[PDB]
Paper text:
We also present a 3.3 Å resolution cryo-EM structure of the homo-heptameric mechanosensitive channel MscS from E. coli. His-tagged MscS was purified in DDM, reconstituted into peptidiscs using the on-beads method and further purified by SEC. The final map reached a resolution of 3.3 Å, close to the resolutions of 2.9 Å and 3.1 Å of the recently published cryo-EM maps of MscS reconstituted into nanodiscs. As MscS in nanodiscs, our map of MscS in peptidiscs shows the channel in the closed conformation, with perfect seven-fold symmetry that could be docked into our map using Chimera, followed by refinement in PHENIX. However, unlike the map of MscS in nanodiscs that resolves bound lipids, our map of MscS in peptidiscs, like the X-ray crystallographic structure of detergent-solubilized MscS, does not show any density representing lipids associated with MscS. In the case of MscS, the peptide densities are organized very differently from those seen in the MsbA maps. Importantly, all helical segments run essentially parallel to the membrane plane and form a continuous band of helical segments, surrounding the transmembrane domain of MscS at a level corresponding to the cytoplasmic leaflet of the membrane. A second continuous band is also present at the level corresponding to the periplasmic leaflet of the membrane, but these helical segments appear shorter and less well defined in our map. Thus, unlike in the case of MsbA, the arrangement of the peptidisc peptides surrounding the MscS channel is reminiscent of the double-belt model proposed for how MSPs encircle the lipids in nanodisc.
Recently, our laboratory introduced the peptidisc as a novel type of peptide scaffold designed to keep membrane proteins stable in solution without detergent. When the peptidisc peptide is mixed with detergent-solubilized membrane protein and the detergent is removed, multiple copies of the peptide associate with the transmembrane domain, embedding the protein in a peptidisc, which can also incorporate lipids that may be bound to the membrane proteins. Notably, the arrangements of the peptidisc peptides around MsbA and MscS are very different, revealing the structural basis for how the peptidisc scaffold can adapt to membrane proteins of different sizes, shapes and symmetries.
Residue numbers in the entry:
A (entry chain A), B (entry chain B), C (entry chain C), D (entry chain D), E (entry chain E), F (entry chain F), ...: 27 to 280
Write the structure that this text describes.
């Protein structure tokens, strides 16, 4: 009877010294690893309150008090902390998944669901990537894994799609001749792949030719800019008119 | 009383020699399987902390301290890891579902909810597919199973829909005659299927004929381009005018 | 004391032979039914690891070690696999619900929440349906049950709605006379149902008559196309003008 | 010792014969009710595997093996089936709620969050409703309860809102006189309720009068069509002009 | 030994008679209060199956069979019914909270996240409200509590905002004089509150004055209509022009 | 044996009298605090059913239910109530957060994710706030914590941004001179802060100057209105034209 | 027998004095910390009711009444409070994550998914940040972690993108010469990085040159404004016309 009481006080004193030991130990461990001391002491007070809660419940169990009430409420409070940390630990799990199944490496130009940039680093909780215009975007890993990963650096060839609106009076064969001469005289265009120049659309004010052209993934934007400037030059020289928005107006004297 | 004593320490030392050996074993196993050697030791430290937690709880239970507090908090922490890994393990389950119920195979041109490409591979956690313009999209499997799978390589015949806007003054029977001559003289159009040429819409500035035409799944875009170019040529030759946006203007000199 | 040790090793050996024979049996059942070998051996390794986990826990319990730690973590790992498989087993439950409460059968042209096609088959995890333009859409059953099911093959008679924009100067009674003559002389229109021709809207540039017309579900699109072509013909013959977008211009010379 | 073994084999044989008899009984109970046999045999195999799992667990417990691991994993698999059936059983609960608290009955024209039609039947898992244009929409009950229920057949009177755009030069008092004569000479308009004819908006090209008019729920669309046709007739007769889109243009030079 | 068997059959017979009496009593209670019997018989069959399940597994426990596997599956089926009834019970909890914290009473014109109407009644599961145009909307209580409650009947004074577009040629001080004379000569406008007449915006074709004016919550729409009609009258009398959409057109004849 | 019977009937009678006492006390406390007799009687009936459920189970346990059948079902029914209560008391937790972290509690004009107004009161489940146009919006606290809080009375100085579109013929230095004279002669503009007058955009028909100007949080709307009216006055006085939507028009033949 | 009754009353009295002392102690602890007593007494009454509930259940267990029913309902109520506090404790966990993995510090101009401003402080539950236009936005931490963190202060160099629309008649080489002279004569433009001046687009009415220019993060907006004003000045001096929206008008003249 009193043996359970002295055993319970023994559990209390060993639990308090273990609580102070583990609390100060994780204080030292987060001062050494991390930098902050305020939230380190906050988490250390959380762990200290956890160990003294564990040992107070174990002591009230050693006395003989049926202790399942605080067991159920402490389990639901741990489950509260669990459904809280669902997002952060999901970022952790997506991070280890994204570094063991790696669809991008540090330097691969990707498009992670609406933002596109070169991956500077894949950390444990987030990938830092630098945008094309200098912005640093720190995307969490759950937002990456839960969406698509459009990797632009895994295939060495990509495809420019030019859409040229010419007038309806413009001859289809002359436009196709000039566009084929432009995309054939250009050296960075892969000739062994698709080189489509065909009438894509009968537009409202114009008529739209599509020019689908494969090139290297590094020369892609320069092929777009050079073939577009050459299209403008050769079309203005050859008399083919890029039309303005056209209206037919039926005038009426009131 | 002493039977619980150092026999509990025998449990706590038979557990540490299992914890270290299982940590070293999963380090060697994941170095053999998928080398990272930097989050591999983190997962090994997680498994080590789990096994030493199991054996510390079992040793405190063998002594006589009623362990149901750390049991409930460890179960809630396991459920935290569970609701964390909900997304990744749902990708795994959707991957084994997608490879045992396979709606696409490696090479089938599909459309998985807004992105469309040829599936290069269906891995365990993601399908890599190459877009029509060269981009590699690594879609997770839960995002595929949670949405539609529009497969273009399962049926060998598909349907082009042309919408030709002609002027309101143009004769309906002449447009239907010329469009039927275009879709009948074209050989890749399946003649035993639907060949609809009918007045679809009375538009604002135009009047829209629909041309629904069945052709083979490989010949489909070429049928679209050739029949559209032939429509432009034969309509310009026959005098039917594709109209511009039309306005009726009632000018008022003020 | 040692009786529990030899009993624990007995549970160990019967569990290892059970872990071999159940894994071999599910390899048999997955090679015969739903044929695959790689992910079938993956699932077999999962079932083998599960059975050896069950029997290692049972052996450590039969020895005398309080084993509730791995019980709670294994229950939370089962709950991890459960909240993972939530989506796939919800597709399973929605599939058996969709086939025992069947709102569509194999062949019924439906509209399952933004995609519309004829249901080729209702499988256990997904309905395959062929779109009107040849595409095969494999919709999961949870996405079908969680949204509406617009069935076009359940009523034999449906309703075309024409909206004819005529000019503001056109006589309302002449337009109603001509539209009623068109929808009365057409034989596939159900005359015993609603045949509405009334002035629907005072539009911006036009004035919109509505023509609500009931006809059979197979003849519906042909009734639409024939009555629309007849509307264009008879309105052009009778002098009623479908107007262009109208502007009133008050020009004032700066 | 061996008494527990023969008792365990007794539980094994009574559970196997109970599993076979209850699988045959649930097969009869489904084939009499829902006359699909394939998914009936699937659910029967599920119930058979569940009861033989129950009795294998009970036998391994009666032998003396601590059968807590398979109980925890089986409870988590029951929770897998539970979070799976969350959607379908939520449709069931919303169906019994929607038929015991019934905001619509079979025949009542409603608008269940988007789609709008007359409810043909409220079943247990879904309400079938027929749209105004003939389409059958089978809406699940959770989608109905989770959204608004805009019931049109609960109140016998409703309100038409005409918006008449007249020119800026038109006299406000003459428009209000003519609109009040139109909405007063019409007999299906409830005269004891609100009859608003007032200047609602100073539009861009027009000026918008609102006409808010109460009438019976069956006469509502006919009141709209007749008062709109009368508005067009009397406004064209009295010289009030529904204006086209108006532009003030300041002409300039090159 | 046989004492447990006769005790188990005793629990069987008392549980079957309690199951029949509670099933028939719940059926009678759902007849006298919930007149529909087609789902009352189903709910009573559910309660009957539940009580016979409880007493069958209680008798299987009283025999001596370790029964804690069907306890886990039954407690997961109860949690299936729980996560099913999550929506309906959330409507019940939001209803009792919406009637003990009442932000609207029966008759108060509100806007419950989108739809807006006068609350006819707040029931336990839904608030019925009549729209301004006669429609009856039965909003569930979880959708009300989860969103905003814009109550228009809690403050007796509200604010009209007129936005008058005048021409750029119009004098600012004359427009402000006429608008201030209109909003000062009007008696239902609260003169002790804000009366703003100031230049709000330099629009594309016009220039927009804002007139923010406080008036009583019942007189608000009539103040809007009377001040807008007076603005049109006084501005047409004073020569200030409400401008049409303006274009500056540069002639480029060739 | 019969001692457990008389003890069970003792538990029955003490539980029934405690049920009546606690239900009467809860009805007293609810008719004192949160007065509504109908739903307080409903909640007291729920608490009465709960206490008679607890005591019927606790009495029938010793003569019966054999380790937690009805307890395992009642715990899941408690969690059924608990998911409803998590949806509702997420507002209570957010309310005690919103009071102990005090982001707007005094009456500060804020913008709580969309709607914006002066906070009338922060209650326990909702913040009532009065909009700028008189509407009372009762936002729940979970909707506030789940979104941003844009507090306008936390910083005493804020920023007006004028965007002035002038013509392309306007001299940039003259526009910058006049705008700097307007924003320098105005006394409520903070001159020690940013005063930006620079060419923001080359518009389609205009050219847009940005005027970023810091002023006090009370004087800000009056600074906007006064500087905008002064911009219109001085720009019309100095010959700088606010352009209409310009449109170069190239004439053609029929 | 009576020893359990006097022990139960002992637990009752020690739990009541412990409940009063912990309730008043957390009143004192919060009044020292956060000095709203009105919710401090609310939380203190919650903790008092929790401790008296724990000790009432412990006393009913020490008497001998099987008390697992209220254990299950109290655990489900703890899970109700936990899943209610899910969002608040997720903000807490995201706050300690955001301060131990800090992607922004106090002062770093960021864009936290939409809103963008300089982070004034990162607290435990929210980050306060001041917008560029003076507004104070208190973003919760879970909303920050759940989205991207676009940090503008981590890289010292960023990129302006000018899009200059010139006329179609303008010479491409003259525009590229003038734009290269502007972006080369400007000193704050980083010349060792990308300096792109190339033909980006053939627009509808214009033709769009892109000018991608790298400059320091503090000089970025001033580089944009200075190069845009210089583009307007030098282009008007050199005769290059920024075109208005262009229409081609075909006179039909009825």
């Amino acid at each position: 009877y009193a043996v359970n009481i002295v055993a319970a006080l023994a559990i209390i004193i060993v639990g308090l010294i273990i609580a102070r030991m583990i609390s100060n130990a994780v204080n030292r461990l987060m001062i050494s690893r991390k930098i902050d001391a305020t939230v380190a002491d906050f988490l250390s007070a959380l762990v200290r309150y956890g160990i003294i809660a564990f040992t107070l419940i174990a002591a009230l169990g050693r006395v003989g008090v049926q202790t399942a009430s605080v067991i159920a409420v402490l389990g639901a409070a741990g489950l509260a902390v669990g459904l809280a940390l669902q997002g952060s630990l999901s970022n952790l799990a997506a991070g280890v998944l994204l570094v063991m199944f790696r669809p991008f490496r540090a330097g691969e130009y990707v498009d992670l669901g609406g933002v596109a940039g070169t991956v500077l680093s894949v950390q444990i909780f987030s990938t830092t990537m630098r945008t094309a215009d200098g912005k640093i975007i720190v995307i969490p890993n759950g937002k990456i894994i839960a969406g698509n990963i459009i990797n632009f650096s895994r295939e060495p060839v990509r495809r420019n799609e030019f859409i040229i609106g010419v007038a309806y009076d413009s001859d289809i064969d002359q436009v196709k001749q000039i566009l084929t001469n432009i995309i054939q005289s250009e050296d960075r265009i892969l000739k062994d792949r698709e080189m489509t120049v065909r009438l894509n659309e009968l537009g409202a004010s114009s008529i739209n030719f599509v020019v689908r052209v494969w090139s290297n993934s590094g020369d892609l934007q320069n092929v777009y800019w050079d073939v577009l400037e050459r299209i403008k030059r050769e079309f203005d020289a050859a008399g083919i008119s890029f039309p303005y928005p056209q209206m037919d107006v039926n005038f009426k004297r009131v």
